Design an enzyme around this catalytic site. Sequence first.
Site, PDB file in Angstrom:
ATOM      1  N   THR A  12       0.811  -1.219   0.000  1.00 37.14           N
ATOM      2  CA  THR A  12       0.000   0.000   0.000  1.00 37.14           C
ATOM      3  C   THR A  12       0.849   1.276   0.000  1.00 37.14           C
ATOM      4  O   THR A  12       0.292   2.378   0.057  1.00 37.14           O
ATOM      5  CB  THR A  12      -1.013   0.024   1.179  1.00 37.14           C
ATOM      6  N   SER A  84       8.957   2.072   3.412  1.00 37.45           N
ATOM      7  CA  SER A  84       9.204   3.491   3.605  1.00 37.45           C
ATOM      8  C   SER A  84      10.691   3.776   3.696  1.00 37.45           C
ATOM      9  O   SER A  84      11.482   2.943   4.155  1.00 37.45           O
ATOM     10  CB  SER A  84       8.535   3.976   4.895  1.00 37.45           C
ATOM     11  N   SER A 109      13.952  -2.816  -1.191  1.00 38.83           N
ATOM     12  CA  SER A 109      13.388  -1.477  -1.328  1.00 38.83           C
ATOM     13  C   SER A 109      14.502  -0.494  -1.665  1.00 38.83           C
ATOM     14  O   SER A 109      15.185   0.031  -0.785  1.00 38.83           O
ATOM     15  CB  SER A 109      12.639  -1.059  -0.067  1.00 38.83           C
ATOM     16  N   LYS A 122      20.179   0.784   3.503  1.00 37.46           N
ATOM     17  CA  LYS A 122      19.982   0.016   2.277  1.00 37.46           C
ATOM     18  C   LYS A 122      21.170  -0.887   1.977  1.00 37.46           C
ATOM     19  O   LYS A 122      20.997  -2.001   1.472  1.00 37.46           O
ATOM     20  CB  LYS A 122      19.741   0.957   1.106  1.00 37.46           C
TER      21      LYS A 122
HETATM   22  N1  LIG Z   1      12.568   9.976  -6.030  1.00 33.49           N
HETATM   23  C1  LIG Z   1      12.728   8.584  -5.664  1.00 33.49           C
HETATM   24  O1  LIG Z   1      13.341   7.749  -6.235  1.00 33.49           O
HETATM   25  C2  LIG Z   1      12.070   8.115  -4.428  1.00 33.49           C
HETATM   26  C3  LIG Z   1      12.627   6.861  -3.822  1.00 33.49           C
HETATM   27  N2  LIG Z   1      11.797   6.238  -2.881  1.00 33.49           N
HETATM   28  C4  LIG Z   1      12.201   4.991  -2.296  1.00 33.49           C
HETATM   29  O2  LIG Z   1      11.030   3.946  -2.764  1.00 33.49           O
HETATM   30  C5  LIG Z   1      10.892   3.072  -1.774  1.00 33.49           C
HETATM   31  C6  LIG Z   1       9.431   3.130  -1.177  1.00 33.49           C
HETATM   32  O3  LIG Z   1       9.279   4.445  -0.785  1.00 33.49           O
HETATM   33  P1  LIG Z   1       7.677   4.798  -0.635  1.00 33.49           P
HETATM   34  O4  LIG Z   1       7.102   4.209  -1.930  1.00 33.49           O
HETATM   35  O5  LIG Z   1       7.733   6.330  -0.623  1.00 33.49           O
HETATM   36  O6  LIG Z   1       7.198   4.059   0.730  1.00 33.49           O
HETATM   37  P2  LIG Z   1       5.907   4.321   1.795  1.00 33.49           P
HETATM   38  O7  LIG Z   1       6.097   5.487   2.759  1.00 33.49           O
HETATM   39  O8  LIG Z   1       4.790   4.357   0.794  1.00 33.49           O
HETATM   40  O9  LIG Z   1       5.493   3.034   2.673  1.00 33.49           O
HETATM   41  C7  LIG Z   1       5.624   1.859   1.943  1.00 33.49           C
HETATM   42  C8  LIG Z   1       5.262   0.619   2.843  1.00 33.49           C
HETATM   43  O10 LIG Z   1       6.056   0.565   3.900  1.00 33.49           O
HETATM   44  C9  LIG Z   1       5.377  -0.472   4.955  1.00 33.49           C
HETATM   45  N3  LIG Z   1       5.872  -0.008   6.218  1.00 33.49           N
HETATM   46  C10 LIG Z   1       6.179   1.184   6.751  1.00 33.49           C
HETATM   47  N4  LIG Z   1       6.674   0.963   8.009  1.00 33.49           N
HETATM   48  C11 LIG Z   1       6.632  -0.408   8.201  1.00 33.49           C
HETATM   49  C12 LIG Z   1       7.013  -1.120   9.264  1.00 33.49           C
HETATM   50  N5  LIG Z   1       7.586  -0.687  10.520  1.00 33.49           N
HETATM   51  N6  LIG Z   1       6.901  -2.428   9.343  1.00 33.49           N
HETATM   52  C13 LIG Z   1       6.384  -3.065   8.236  1.00 33.49           C
HETATM   53  N7  LIG Z   1       6.000  -2.333   7.148  1.00 33.49           N
HETATM   54  C14 LIG Z   1       6.143  -1.006   7.133  1.00 33.49           C
HETATM   55  C15 LIG Z   1       4.138  -0.285   4.764  1.00 33.49           C
HETATM   56  O11 LIG Z   1       3.758  -1.539   4.052  1.00 33.49           O
HETATM   57  P3  LIG Z   1       2.183  -1.934   3.991  1.00 33.49           P
HETATM   58  O12 LIG Z   1       1.568  -1.277   2.754  1.00 33.49           O
HETATM   59  O13 LIG Z   1       2.187  -3.438   4.032  1.00 33.49           O
HETATM   60  O14 LIG Z   1       1.552  -1.406   5.207  1.00 33.49           O
HETATM   61  C16 LIG Z   1       4.068   0.866   3.728  1.00 33.49           C
HETATM   62  O15 LIG Z   1       2.815   0.589   3.168  1.00 33.49           O
HETATM   63  C17 LIG Z   1      11.837   3.553  -0.668  1.00 33.49           C
HETATM   64  O16 LIG Z   1      13.019   2.899  -0.814  1.00 33.49           O
HETATM   65  C18 LIG Z   1      12.193   4.986  -0.980  1.00 33.49           C
HETATM   66  O17 LIG Z   1      13.555   5.055  -0.292  1.00 33.49           O
HETATM   67  C19 LIG Z   1      10.576   6.880  -2.498  1.00 33.49           C
HETATM   68  C20 LIG Z   1      10.406   8.426  -2.644  1.00 33.49           C
HETATM   69  C21 LIG Z   1      11.129   9.116  -3.824  1.00 33.49           C
HETATM   70  C1  LIG Z   2       8.577  18.350  -1.429  1.00 36.23           C
HETATM   71  O1  LIG Z   2       9.839  17.899  -1.801  1.00 36.23           O
HETATM   72  C2  LIG Z   2      10.412  17.138  -0.859  1.00 36.23           C
HETATM   73  C3  LIG Z   2      10.849  15.871  -1.169  1.00 36.23           C
HETATM   74  C4  LIG Z   2      11.453  15.109  -0.200  1.00 36.23           C
HETATM   75  C5  LIG Z   2      11.889  13.808  -0.436  1.00 36.23           C
HETATM   76  O2  LIG Z   2      10.853  13.032  -0.863  1.00 36.23           O
HETATM   77  C6  LIG Z   2      11.454  11.812  -1.173  1.00 36.23           C
HETATM   78  C7  LIG Z   2      12.572  12.258  -1.974  1.00 36.23           C
HETATM   79  C8  LIG Z   2      12.681  13.748  -1.607  1.00 36.23           C
HETATM   80  C9  LIG Z   2      14.071  13.917  -1.168  1.00 36.23           C
HETATM   81  O3  LIG Z   2      14.652  12.798  -1.719  1.00 36.23           O
HETATM   82  C10 LIG Z   2      13.785  11.774  -1.354  1.00 36.23           C
HETATM   83  C11 LIG Z   2      14.322  10.614  -1.866  1.00 36.23           C
HETATM   84  C12 LIG Z   2      14.332   9.549  -1.003  1.00 36.23           C
HETATM   85  C13 LIG Z   2      14.880   8.347  -1.364  1.00 36.23           C
HETATM   86  C14 LIG Z   2      15.455   8.239  -2.599  1.00 36.23           C
HETATM   87  O4  LIG Z   2      15.997   7.064  -2.934  1.00 36.23           O
HETATM   88  C15 LIG Z   2      15.481   9.301  -3.485  1.00 36.23           C
HETATM   89  O5  LIG Z   2      16.067   9.099  -4.673  1.00 36.23           O
HETATM   90  C16 LIG Z   2      15.932  10.130  -5.587  1.00 36.23           C
HETATM   91  C17 LIG Z   2      14.917  10.507  -3.115  1.00 36.23           C
HETATM   92  C18 LIG Z   2      11.612  15.647   1.069  1.00 36.23           C
HETATM   93  C19 LIG Z   2      11.184  16.917   1.396  1.00 36.23           C
HETATM   94  C20 LIG Z   2      10.583  17.664   0.416  1.00 36.23           C
HETATM   95  O6  LIG Z   2      10.164  18.908   0.677  1.00 36.23           O
END
Ligand SMILES: NC(=O)C1=CN([C@@H]2O[C@H](COP(=O)(O)OP(=O)(O)OC[C@H]3O[C@@H](n4cnc5c(N)ncnc54)[C@H](OP(=O)(O)O)[C@@H]3O)[C@@H](O)[C@H]2O)C=CC1
Ligand SMILES: COc1cc([C@H]2OC[C@H]3[C@@H]2CO[C@@H]3c2ccc(O)c(OC)c2)ccc1O
Lengths: 286, 284
Positions: A12, A84, A109, A122
């Site tokens: 989710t 997360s 992740s 990671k």
């Molecule tokens: N620009 C980019 O490339 C970005 C990179 N990312 C990376 O993508 C990956 C996912 O990020 P995101 O999609 O934002 O994740 P989320 O904040 O959406 O949470 C994803 C899932 O984490 C599970 N979760 C959270 N805490 C726990 C816990 N203590 N125990 C078990 N399950 C937990 C939950 O699974 P459930 O649904 O089962 O409850 C949650 O639904 C991360 O690695 C993030 O670092 C994300 C943001 C930007």
């Molecule tokens: C609103 O823009 C924001 C974004 C963020 C972060 O959301 C997730 C993104 C961004 C900063 O970088 C985060 C991030 C986290 C994990 C990653 O692997 C990643 O790769 C680009 C990027 C934090 C504060 C902010 O004000």
Amino acid sequence: GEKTRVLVVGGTGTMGRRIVRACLAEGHETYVLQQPETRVDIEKVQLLYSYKRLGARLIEASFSDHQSLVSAVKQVDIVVAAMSGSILVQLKLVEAIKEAGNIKRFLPSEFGMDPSRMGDQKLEVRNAIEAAGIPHTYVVGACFAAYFAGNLSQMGTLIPPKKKVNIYGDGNVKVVYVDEDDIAEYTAKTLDDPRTINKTVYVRPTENVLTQMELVQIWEKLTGKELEKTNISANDFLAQAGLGHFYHIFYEGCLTDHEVGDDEEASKLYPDVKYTRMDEYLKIFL
Amino acid sequence: GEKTRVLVVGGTGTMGRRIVRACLAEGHETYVLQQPETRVDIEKVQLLYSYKRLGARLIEASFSDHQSLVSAVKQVDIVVAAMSGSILVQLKLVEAIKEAGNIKRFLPSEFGMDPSRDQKLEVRNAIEAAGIPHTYVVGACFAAYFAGNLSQMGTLIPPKKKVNIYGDGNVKVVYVDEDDIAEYTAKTLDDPRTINKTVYVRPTENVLTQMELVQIWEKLTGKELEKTNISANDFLAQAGLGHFYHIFYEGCLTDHEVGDDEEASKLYPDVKYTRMDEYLKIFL
Ligand SMILES: NC(=O)C1=CN([C@@H]2O[C@H](COP(=O)(O)OP(=O)(O)OC[C@H]3O[C@@H](n4cnc5c(N)ncnc54)[C@H](OP(=O)(O)O)[C@@H]3O)[C@@H](O)[C@H]2O)C=CC1
Ligand SMILES: COc1cc([C@H]2OC[C@H]3[C@@H]2CO[C@@H]3c2ccc(O)c(OC)c2)ccc1O
Ligand SMILES: NC(=O)C1=CN([C@@H]2O[C@H](COP(=O)(O)OP(=O)(O)OC[C@H]3O[C@@H](n4cnc5c(N)ncnc54)[C@H](OP(=O)(O)O)[C@@H]3O)[C@@H](O)[C@H]2O)C=CC1
Ligand SMILES: COc1cc([C@H]2OC[C@H]3[C@@H]2CO[C@@H]3c2ccc(O)c(OC)c2)ccc1O
């Protein structure tokens, strides 16, 4: 029957929900981990159960219960996690996969900056995967378009500015902007691809490698209005939430300072994915 | 061209998102209030913009900015509100509607217990003081909050072995899929027959006791659940307890009968509402 069976952990989450549907779209028999409720959370529950209507199965398990993790992973061939960033909880998941012994591949992740070029939890997870001999694929290399493109890389918001926009440095550092759907589709295509086993896959669709000033000008071209830009120096930028990530991406250019081969790049490995270009991505905001 | 123009306030909420979709599905020219972001909230933003793809339009305004509210509601014919139950934020919306003068109907944020037997009643009085035509949609339990958990507290899915029964669980309750509530809302908001009326969402086959709900489930699962009856006083001995008490011990949703001219399932018999045997199937 001949489906690859995939368990999605973090189903989710922002990326998790997209990986669930992308596995289904690709025809995998798709299982989503169902964790016990920690609150009354209608949105999470209804999301999980909407997956059933699309043909997915739920498996209840808890990271606090090792044998429930083991039982879940024994029902699948491949595990993808999108927690997360919560990252270190995958250690319990790795322990389960090792004991189960049936998992053909584990995608942990990642989906962001390659952490192994930022010299961290990671890498600790990677080390456990590889010490246990679990075949792996690491999907890295892209900014989520929702977090970095729709806001023209401004912080504190997710939509385009009306008038004013900060430009990091000269806005001439190349960044990789990718629609999270495409990251999820690349992930679903790669998880049983023999070419990517035990590899890092870089999501760097060629036409989406853009400088911030290039992205801003895609948007100015769609609106017909020039934005008022003020550039921020590294020192002034360096003078809490996420400011480090931004610096590496937009000042150090960590996503583009290395080249990647076509045998490790998602858009070359999977050319039939018509990934969303940022001029199309930004149209929703007009 | 001939479509009713509707402004949904609360468009990203549980009920609000369904009202947005149900309005588009009726053919209403549908507008959604876009409030300033209070945080980085990616699911909220993306829900909002997904509506545009279906034909909705976004109107930016803020409750802190009276004139931006007046400006928003001048662009529509009807406003539907589904705010968090915050309810009082609607008082700004009423003053805005009153000054605008163009609104044919306002449906305030109701969608549950009748508050006229409260912040909701205060909104009602201000709506009526201002002479704004209204419809009040009331009278049902959201199925996700009360049916899928077999009316247990603290969970939204069925229990595996045990269940608490309130009293003897033979007080009648109204369980309704939130999508049906939203569809009835979309159908009723421009219906002449419900102007300045309360509309009771009481689909006949979904008027059920908690025990009848439980027995629906046991029959789908073929498994009998271990039942513990909780008396009124042991209950009168935590969020939401007052609500469960009025619903399950006093039967406030079903103690007054309702006429066909004011009950949603008869007003709109074409709505093939979800019965609870079908609603619970997704949990099996
Ligand atoms: N620009 C980019 O490339 C970005 C990179 N990312 C990376 O993508 C990956 C996912 O990020 P995101 O999609 O934002 O994740 P989320 O904040 O959406 O949470 C994803 C899932 O984490 C599970 N979760 C959270 N805490 C726990 C816990 N203590 N125990 C078990 N399950 C937990 C939950 O699974 P459930 O649904 O089962 O409850 C949650 O639904 C991360 O690695 C993030 O670092 C994300 C943001 C930007
Ligand atoms: C609103 O823009 C924001 C974004 C963020 C972060 O959301 C997730 C993104 C961004 C900063 O970088 C985060 C991030 C986290 C994990 C990653 O692997 C990643 O790769 C680009 C990027 C934090 C504060 C902010 O004000
Ligand atoms: N069983 C039943 O019959 C049920 C009845 N209800 C009733 O449904 C109605 C809606 O409940 P629900 O769907 O749960 O609402 P939600 O909790 O989902 O929130 C709805 C909207 O409230 C807006 N909101 C919250 N605080 C503010 C604020 N300070 N200022 C401006 N806007 C705010 C937000 O709109 P935005 O999208 O713009 O961001 C939010 O999206 C309520 O009247 C509730 O009593 C609800 C639960 C069960
Ligand atoms: C049925 O009418 C309403 C019900 C409610 C809430 O009453 C309590 C219920 C429901 C929303 O979710 C509440 C709830 C509170 C605590 C819980 O532990 C719970 O478990 C499902 C459910 C609010 C407004 C209403 O108009």
